[PDB]
Amino acid sequence: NELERINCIPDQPPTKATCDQRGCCWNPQAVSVPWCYYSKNHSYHVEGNLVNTNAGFTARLKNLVFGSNVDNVLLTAEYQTSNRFHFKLTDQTNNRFEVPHHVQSFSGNAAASLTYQVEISRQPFSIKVTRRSNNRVLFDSSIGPLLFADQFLQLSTRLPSTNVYGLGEHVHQQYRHDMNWKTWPIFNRDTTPNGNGTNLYGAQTFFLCLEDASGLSFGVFLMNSNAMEVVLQPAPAITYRTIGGILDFYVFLGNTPEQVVQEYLELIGRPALPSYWALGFHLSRYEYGTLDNMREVVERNRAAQLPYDVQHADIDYMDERRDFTYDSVDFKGFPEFVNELHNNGQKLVIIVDPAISNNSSSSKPYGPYDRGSDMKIWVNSSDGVTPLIGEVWPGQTVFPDYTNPNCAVWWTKEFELFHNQVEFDGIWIDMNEVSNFVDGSVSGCSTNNLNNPPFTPRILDGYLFCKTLCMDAVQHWGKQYDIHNLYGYSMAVATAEAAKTVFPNKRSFILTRSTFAGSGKFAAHWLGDNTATWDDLRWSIPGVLEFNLFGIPMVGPDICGFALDTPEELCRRWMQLGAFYPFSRNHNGQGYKDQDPASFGADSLLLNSSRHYLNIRYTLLPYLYTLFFRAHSRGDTVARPLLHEFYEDNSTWDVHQQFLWGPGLLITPVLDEGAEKVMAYVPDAVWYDYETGSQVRWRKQKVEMELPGDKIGLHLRGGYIFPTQQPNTTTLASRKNPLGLIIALDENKEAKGELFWDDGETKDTVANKVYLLCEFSVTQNRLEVNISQSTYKDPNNLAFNEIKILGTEEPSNVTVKHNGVPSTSPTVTYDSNLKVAIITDIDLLLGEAYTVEWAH
Ligand SMILES: O=S(=O)([O-])O[C@@H]([C@H](O)C[S@+]1C[C@@H](O)[C@H](O)[C@H]1CO)[C@@H](O)CO
Ligand SMILES: *[C@@H]1O[C@H](CO)[C@@H](O)[C@H](O)[C@H]1NC(C)=O
Ligand SMILES: *[C@@H]1O[C@H](CO)[C@@H](O)[C@H](O)[C@H]1NC(C)=O
């Protein structure tokens, strides 16, 4: 079976002599089927018996090209929970680099009631994880060898299906991985997210596999921060091939795909609950140039009444692109503008780069450099004593070593000092791969096994130190070779630590470019420097879905496209979709035509449609916020693939041009130039048009959805109750408004929903239980508002003043009881054609239990 051959010459075009040299098999009978492949027996074997331990078992593995092979390998397996299996493969005799991650070591006894069983084979070594309930083989290394050299470690697994989702950071273009022969390199790199499928800004080894239509799913995570590649083949099978550290694997079983994400996030860390304001709309560009220009853009979008919470300021606010300064001429009056923003209920987020100008003297001192030098907190060259010099925006630079706890002290004080001048509200950390305009350093990199390893994965440009730091550079956590992929992660950890001081008791907002597994505990993510093309629009959906799997649910691209002038039609469709990315920001590159919504004209279709859909986003913010609460507390996704709700239906398995907000809201954008319709899949559920309330005819079928220039498809799922709040142009204001309920009835006239409500900004409202959690349930004739947690009463005296019911016969004699005690008659408006009832003249106070009853 050619589909099962594991490639033995991953480094060069295949030849018989090399193959012979490697003791592999040769069979040149493509495309991509390996000509040279590992023999069926020629790997590691178990030495002696396995050893029962308290956590699981250990085995000793012994071996009979890419550096020193490790002769004796220790397998350590731990039955951590009923649904999480952990195994490490280490050097029996030498300690090796391991990621200094949230994840703690396991000091436990083996969990009870396992959903999985593990089987080890001895001659040759293989590891298999099967699901106990149906003996479905989930992990199975037997397809390939274990390879364990100092700078080349490889393990493969067969997969039980081709329903495979995950890996990053890349532009995959499709959400489902085909399992056609494909190699995905992972090594944090500043590169364009384009159709080339290169390594991008972040490193995410997690994948999820939907096993079958029952929903049974599993996930695999590799805890490894060295450059690596993930090799996919049609067996189906996946191979991990890394150039350092150890093979430290976790396997997660769930009954559903969402349960798999929850298991993964339980291990690596669930996402931060964002500030409610950060759910609003964000506007930004590279190079307004002057404060006057920035204010002009701010004012025209406010004039247009655009829902608009946050303004970002990019490196043009700085004095010559230097951190923690502003330009006293072009940005003269920045403090008064920040007061203006605040007074208008808006927030300022500032960009902050890691790299710190080293240009400092008696004449013109640069404080951040002087103070950081005093603290000795920079990344050093291999000599371990001289700060590494590279180049970024301000010129020659040194780079903070965020892995050193003293650096976060330095960093905090810098933000403290700057915040005294410019009262920013959130922080955008960029260029933190880390990105270097020179290769390695201003003196390049020394030739050695770190900078020039035996094997290099197929990373962009084919050198590790390309546009980053020397691999032999030295930080508190180790050498750059091992911790390069942790730069952005440690930076976000440190920036969150700074936020503890700058915004006491607040969440604030942190947006990061580079990430590692677990970055979502600290920061939001955006998909980087995209381009104003229809390709980039389409590619954004899988990227958003993937980051939700990764526990970074607040994710979005640069709406309308960073690079290039945006066509009006593309920007209009992108704003329409953009009103529904979990992170919604319009951002633009240097020099390009303006693409802020109001720049298209005060009476333009793009402005009108933008305002219209942003008003729907803001209306649905209580529902979106409640989704982020579930993501934070339980590990649920926010932007969700259809297959997560509809896995029983194999027509959902590669849908990637549509997605859900949580379980209940279906989003169908137009993603094709010139189009006024879209080919869409309608899952097996009752659906209601959001704007009209009318039940679609469609069910479990492909349709051509008619969507003119001012429309994006939005459908509400029957069985669900959506809390709403009357929109306004800021969430400061919107949070004071009356609330509503949209009850989308299922075929049985029933629905369920919930609402999380806290102060929208205090850190640890969830850990300290200072919040409201209520549940809504509808049966025929009755709505029940039930209160499950009631330790926060909003002092704005909020109430539900409207209930809209979809797919209903006329409700008559509506009664509102506050524990069996009625209170006068609400007004009911009924549309008998559309089957929509709207209950108004009602005053259901937030946090109070009610029963609303009717007859037919
Ligand atoms: O095309 S480019 O502008 O020159 O792209 C460069 C940066 O990634 C852009 S940064 C991130 C983006 O969101 C901010 O607006 C930009 C200013 O801080 C790379 O070329 C540097 O290697
Ligand atoms: C970097 O160099 C300074 C001396 O210049 C030293 O104090 C510091 O600990 C070094 N950092 C690392 C990570 O080795
Ligand atoms: C919206 O907020 C503005 C304050 O900017 C306020 O004047 C107005 O009353 C608010 N109205 C709504 C729709 O809540």
Curated annotation (Swiss-Prot):
Residues that hold acarbose according to the record: 190, 314, 513, 529, 587
Disulphide linkage map: 8-24, 19-36, 560-571
Stretches the record annotates as Maltase: 257-638
Entry's localization field: Apical cell membrane
Active-site residue list: 430 (nucleophile), 433
Chain positions found as Sulfotyrosine: 317, 326
Assembly with partners or alone: Monomer.
Family affiliation: Belongs to the glycosyl hydrolase 31 family.
Protein known as: Maltase-glucoamylase
UniProt gene name: MGAM
Span within the parent record: 94 to 954 of 2753
